[PDB]
Amino acid sequence: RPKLYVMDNGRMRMDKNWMIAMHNPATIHNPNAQTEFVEFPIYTVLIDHPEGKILFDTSCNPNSMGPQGRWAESTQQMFPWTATEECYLHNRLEQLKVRPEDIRYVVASHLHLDHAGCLEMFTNATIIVHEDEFNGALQCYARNQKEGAYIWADIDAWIKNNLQWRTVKRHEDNILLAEGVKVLNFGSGHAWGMLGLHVELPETGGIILASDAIYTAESYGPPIKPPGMIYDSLGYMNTVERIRRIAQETKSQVWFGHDAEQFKKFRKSTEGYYE
Amino acid sequence: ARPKLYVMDNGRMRMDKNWMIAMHNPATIHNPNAQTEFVEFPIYTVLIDHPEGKILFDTSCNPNSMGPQGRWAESTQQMFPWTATEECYLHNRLEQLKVRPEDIRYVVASHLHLDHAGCLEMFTNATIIVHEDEFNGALQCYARNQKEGAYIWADIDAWIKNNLQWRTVKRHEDNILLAEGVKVLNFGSGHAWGMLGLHVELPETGGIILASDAIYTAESYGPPIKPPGMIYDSLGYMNTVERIRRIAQETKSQVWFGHDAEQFKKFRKSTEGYYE
Ligand SMILES: [Co+2]
Ligand SMILES: [Co+2]
Ligand SMILES: [Fe+3]
Ligand SMILES: [Fe+3]
């Protein structure tokens, strides 16, 4: 039945303390400990499903970087994004002969700059997002916050393009989107409200798309190593452990948000698909 | 009641500023290998000489914490070194006030971190007041034979061997009137598993809130609030800081932070006097 494509949406760099909290602490014999600017991949997933095409995440906006870019300069220097034209999401979809108007459902894991970048392309889709994440992002917009992980100009475009929203409620059960495709309601942790995805493929079997609920394999452990970028510490831990249980009980792979080694291994959209 | 409140200097500690102020100086494209700093801060305790009986808030570090024969693990000693002359040790500070450990009726343990619960074992004639969630969490560290981290196995060992008398504050228990104008504040989860504070109403000085590690420094307090890297419950921490800010406003109280160097310098310490 379905076909699942991994699309390469370029690379981002940032302080590795964001990724792994207190990774290299200062000591009496190393009092001025230095950090490192680590590279990690930005990616999206397309599930070409009989019942309709499902897109997980949307990467960054093409108009994000540069002196005429949407991102504030402080954001550009703290979380720089590098991508060729081939990396842009509209192009990756074009090379698969898929038009934006063909996307039935977009699942926004959360509304950070590197996942919600291109929501505005999908004017014929239902956009699925946690309600707490939505509220949080809209407050950023209304309070006219121009820095941080929530891009004012992105949100501005969502409203102008008249996107059709479907909020997952705080205490809402998981949503069966299609045969073998479930939206997981992870709630608060990394951000205000996280969504994941469990995909059951005939040949490949079970896949959990965790997004920023688990950055990397180092995050996952055990033991768990939580990030510096975090809203609800307790929630974050509960979520990781919950994914570990689901993985075991359903014999599923766990696909992390930004794991460089794992990403290299993936079969990309320019080479083929999973089935 | 006409009490006297004393601030006692129990030495200094140093650690990565990222523990104290999370992501205080993040790396950027043009400064990729940004360095941190190793900041110094005070360790102190408060004595309330009250007519109904003497109350002690926190107990600093154990005299035999540091060194090759030290209770603290080497890794701990290197990340959180404590420097203190003999006169800084709690038992000496009390002596210089003609106070013996057996004179202490109540010990309020803000939490059970290495720099607050170090000297509980001295007070075998007191009721030790502690948050039940903090007490439980420390005991698990003990039972699991965890020898590294902020909860000192040898300290806990001694509390047990010395048969301390405990009184746990329950998770949803209200504030506890310990004496005229002395209330134990139940802050719950945040920096650690279970935080306690103290509100003190002095005739002359007025209101005082002892926050301990619920609020590290003035930099923590803001506004805006700047949370620590050393954090268990992030939401609870934020909730607690705003709660303290409210109480402070409504009761016209000063807020004494856990480890503010500037504020500590301005305090009248036990070698100079007290607060009435
Ligand atoms: Co994110
Ligand atoms: Co502490
Ligand atoms: Fe991300
Ligand atoms: Fe402390």
Q: What is the token pair recorded at B243? A: 């709660």
For residue B32, give the nearest of A22, A33, A37 by CB distance.
A37
Residue B22 at interface with chain A, using a CB cutoff of 8 Å? yes
What's A3-25+32-265's CATH class? Answer: alpha beta
Resolution (A): 2.3
First to last CA, chain B: 10
| Distance in angstroms (rounded) separating the CA atoms of residues B119 and B174 | 27
The whole-angstrom separation of Cα B132 and Cα B171 is 7
Instruction: Establish if A224 touches chain B: CB-CB under 8 angstroms.
Output: no
- Please tell me the total number of residues recorded for chain B in this structure: 276
Other beta carbons less than 10 A from residue B67's beta carbon: 9
Taking the CA atoms of A129, A131, A135 and A140 in sequence, report the sign of the dihedral they define: negative
- Whether cis (ω within 30° of 0) applies to the bond prior to A50 is no
Peptide bond into A41 cis (omega under 30): no
Per-residue DSSP letter, B120? G
Q: Which residue has the tokens 């939206």?
A: A183
C-alpha–C-alpha distance, residues A19 and B5, integer Å:
45
Q: Are A40 and A212 in contact (CB under 8 A)?
A: no
Are β-strands B195-202 and B127-131 bridged in parallel, bridged antiparallel, or unpaired? Answer: unpaired
* Ligand 3 geometric centre to CA of A19 (Å): 10
How many whole angstroms from A77 Cα to the centroid of ligand 3? 16
- Whether the CB of A247 is below 8 Å from some CB of chain B: the reply is no
Collect residues with CB below 5 Å from ion ligand 2: B 113, 213
- For the four alpha carbons of A156, A160, A163 and A165, in that order, the dihedral sign comes to positive
- In contact, A131 and A90? CB cutoff 8 Å: no
Domain boundaries, chain B: 4-266
- The C-alpha atoms of residue A22 and residue B16 are separated, in whole angstroms, by 9
Phi, psi of A128 (to 5 degrees): -100, 125
Into which CATH architecture does domain B4-266 fall? 4-Layer Sandwich (3.60)
At position A140, the amino acid (one-letter code) is C
How many CB pairs below 8 A link A and B? 95
Binding region of B for Fe(3+): 115-116, 213, 259
| d(CA B150, ligand 4 centre) in Å | 10
C-alpha distance from residue A197 to each of A107, B115, B181 (Å): 8, 44, 55
Which tokens sit at A56? 């997980």
Q: Do A233 and B229 touch (CB under 8 A)?
A: no
A-chain CB neighbours of B20 within 8 Å are none
